[PDB]
């Protein structure tokens, strides 16, 4: 019924795909060293997953630190295409579904054209990485982002700025958030683009609109060619709305398991990572 994954890093292993460096510091030598370590850690995590009942992993945005930056000092596709082919071959042999979730500043619906361009360059890097990995069923998960005044205009800029991006559109799936975009609104945007919807259970509880969870899933699931993907997290009892607990609670697991209209891949988003009630 369910495949499980976790994002970016693994705690028992102390492996991460998300080392970076300060921009000061963005020289070929320094970037190569962090990227080397991130790629090594990617393999340790895929191999660990094979042995531990995990089938999903979110690669961290910093795998190749600053890859989409205007001043990135070398040809990273040329440097890493062979190693990424080999890592992806491993991922497939282990039945691992790969994904990526760009950062908070990725908004192709911004009113600032240079923010849009930088955001698209970050999406293109992520999509290229998935291609170099041969991640067929790979997911590039994106929030709809800031309303900058009008939600309506924002959304039409978003769709407009994504519609020509055919490699991004190969992996792109859209996600509901805890403040601006409920599952219903996301479903409309996704339809316009021809992409799947990822339902985040905690974002939905916080910002449900009219839909109960079961219904949000029932409508989101048909948007996938293959296996739907879901994001599961729990509210931390001590922190601001949207803060992820260390562990997903049993209550939240069973609310998800009860609401599922069919098989799904579940990305567990907990501070505990593979200890996340994953």
Report the alpha-carbon distance of residue 189 to residue 213 in Å, rounded.
Answer: 19
Q: Cβ distance 109 to 144 under 8 Å?
A: yes
Q: Is 204 annotated to bind ligand?
A: no
Q: Is 175 annotated to bind ligand?
A: yes
Written as six digits, the tokens of 52 are 């531990």
Residue 83 burial class via C-beta count within 10 angstroms: exposed 0-12, middle 13-18, buried 19 and up: middle
Q: Is 200 annotated to bind ligand?
A: yes
Q: Is 101 annotated to bind ligand?
A: yes
Report the alpha-carbon distance of residue 90 to residue 133 in Å, rounded.
Answer: 9
- What count of other Cβ atoms lies within 10 Å of the Cβ of residue 211? 19
Report the alpha-carbon distance of residue 30 to residue 22 in Å, rounded.
Answer: 10
Q: Is 143 annotated to bind ligand?
A: yes
Nearest CA to 51 out of 10, 100, 101, 2 is that of: 10
Q: Is 9 annotated to bind ligand?
A: no
Conformational region of residue 237, where left means phi above 0, alpha means psi within -120 to 50, and beta covers everything else:
alpha
What residue numbers does the annotated binding site for Mn(2+) cover? 101, 143, 175, 200, 203, 231, 244, 269
What residue numbers does the annotated binding site cover? 101, 143, 175, 200, 203, 231, 244, 269
């Amino acid at each position: 019924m369910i495949r499980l994954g976790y994002p970016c890093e693994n705690l028992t292993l102390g492996a991460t795909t998300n080392r970076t460096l300060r921009l000061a510091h963005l020289t070929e030598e320094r970037v190569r060293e962090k990227a080397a370590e991130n790629l090594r850690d990617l393999e340790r995590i895929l191999r660990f997953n094979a042995d531990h009942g995990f089938a999903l992993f979110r690669i961290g945005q910093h795998l190749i630190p600053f890859a989409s930056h205007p001043l990135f000092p070398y040809d990273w596709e040329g440097a890493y295409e062979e190693e990424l082919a080999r890592l992806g071959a491993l991922a497939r042999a282990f039945g691992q579904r790969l994904s990526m979730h760009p950062g908070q500043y990725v908004n192709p619906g911004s009113p600032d054209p240079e923010v849009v361009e930088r955001s698209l360059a970050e999406l293109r890097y992520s999509a290229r990485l998935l291609s170099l990995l041969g991640a067929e069923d790979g997911v590039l998960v994106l929030h709809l982002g800031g309303a900058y005044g009008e939600k309506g205009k924002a959304l039409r800029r978003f769709v407009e700025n994504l519609r020509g991006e055919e490699e991004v559109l190969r992996y792109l799936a859209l996600e509901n958030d805890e403040r601006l975009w409920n599952v219903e609104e996301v479903l409309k945007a996704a339809e316009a683009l021809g992409v799947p919807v990822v339902v985040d259970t905690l974002h939905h509880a916080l910002n449900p609109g009219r839909l109960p969870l079961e219904e949000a899933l029932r409508l989101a699931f048909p948007t996938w060619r293959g296996r739907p993907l879901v994001h599961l997290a729990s509210q931390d009892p001590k922190k601001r709305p949207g803060a992820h607990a260390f562990r997903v609670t049993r209550e939240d697991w069973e609310r998800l398991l009860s609401a599922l209209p069919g098989p799904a891949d579940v990305m567990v988003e907990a501070k505990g990572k593979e200890q996340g009630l994953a």
